[PDB]
Write a protein that binds this ligand. Structure first.
Ligand SMILES: N[C@@H](CCC(=O)N[C@@H](CS)C(=O)NCC(=O)O)C(=O)O
Ligand SMILES: N[C@@H](CCC(=O)N[C@@H](CS)C(=O)NCC(=O)O)C(=O)O
Lengths: 208, 208
């Protein structure tokens, strides 16, 4: 029923894959090689000339966050009412903002910019620790008491930053425990340990 | 019932203001001067240390797109069903991507980067013309047959780009007619002509 069209990297598809695996959904991975991409035709047929491309039956979507929100609506991972839905969006938009900065560092100036990025990290992660502290003492999810699509995206964001800066979560007990807890969910834990996750690089230029 | 807390610029609050005005809603503008911002306390109290900040009763939201989606959900400007809601999100995410590039040009290297930006513009605007052509001949809205929050955001994006590059819509008949049509809606037209819109600069560094 679902198809993910993407480069052979975790990148912007890692969160939605975790979501699908954790929700026990099945999907197909349509892999696009850089060589195939450079050919040009697939790219020209993409709405914004980029991937991921996602298919849910005959519904074709582009934009990683559009895919996350769509799955969030159809699978019931978007809060229980309008107010929670807004808080879920606020978290996801925050995650996207830091993901954009991470992507800029990785692909644009890893070598010269990493020191400053890492130095500024605590201030960028703190908002999520604060969100958790204001929600049942941080013992459940990022918004309210049920998992949402924002949790999967925030989880990915935290996992890749621990690779970029080992121990960056040591100063945030709530986020630390949160990562441990979500990573232990049976289906997610199995997915995270599997070759289809582990054998894909985080990014496409070999930096992490 | 609504309060918008922002710098005295259109920027990231222009689309949501257009939406509120067009929908006949009333709101309070709480203006924050750069001097007040530099003081530090308001900023430290902002979730992600940034504005806009929005209040809907006792619900406090941050993130311009979260505010747009919230208003979209509560005012019924998010498509008629889940499938349309996903298409609305796809359009908005695309608008955000080009808005990010516009903001980077404006604040980061207007002088040296404008020629290349303007040269790449047609290819960045074409996806929206294509979306319109695939939706009832581009005669109604960007998604389906009812206005959505994505329309207000795409409209702002188009208006600021015509200021940055006059005639950039000449090659796009559907987008051209779309801008004329939406700008003619009574309440929106009055808002667009009013001093509270007209006398605010588009950005905060005087470039446009
Ligand atoms: N806003 C888009 C960004 C998509 C994006 O940056 N795609 C990259 C790979 S992660 C791409 O397709 N690069 C190839 C190109 O632009 O030609 C999303 O979140 O899906
Ligand atoms: N992702 C945020 C971006 C917010 C943003 O860039 N805010 C700027 C002005 S538009 C700001 O608050 N600048 C002051 C600062 O960062 O100290 C949104 O879309 O609301």
């Amino acid at each position: 029923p679902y198809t993910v069209v993407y480069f052979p990297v975790r990148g912007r598809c890692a969160a939605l894959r975790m979501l699908l695996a954790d929700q026990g959904q099945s999907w197909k991975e349509e892999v696009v090689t850089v060589e195939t991409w450079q050919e040009g035709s697939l790219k020209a047929s993409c709405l914004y000339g980029q991937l991921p491309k996602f298919q849910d039956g005959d519904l074709t979507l582009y934009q990683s966050n559009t895919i996350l929100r769509h799955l969030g609506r159809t699978l019931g991972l978007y809060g229980k009412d309008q107010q929670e839905a807004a808080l879920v969006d606020m978290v996801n938009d925050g995650v996207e903002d830091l993901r954009c900065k991470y992507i800029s560092l990785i692909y644009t100036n890893y070598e010269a910019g990493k020191d400053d990025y890492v130095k500024a990290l605590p201030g960028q992660l703190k908002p999520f620790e604060t969100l958790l502290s204001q929600n049942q003492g941080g013992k459940t999810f990022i918004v309210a008491d049920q998992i949402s699509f924002a949790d999967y995206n925030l989880l990915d964001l935290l996992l890749i930053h621990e690779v970029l800066a080992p121990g960056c979560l040591d100063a945030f007990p709530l986020l630390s425990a949160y990562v441990g807890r979500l990573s232990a969910r049976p289906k997610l834990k199995a997915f995270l340990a599997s070759p289809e996750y582990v054998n894909l690089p985080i990014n496409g230029n070999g930096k992490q």
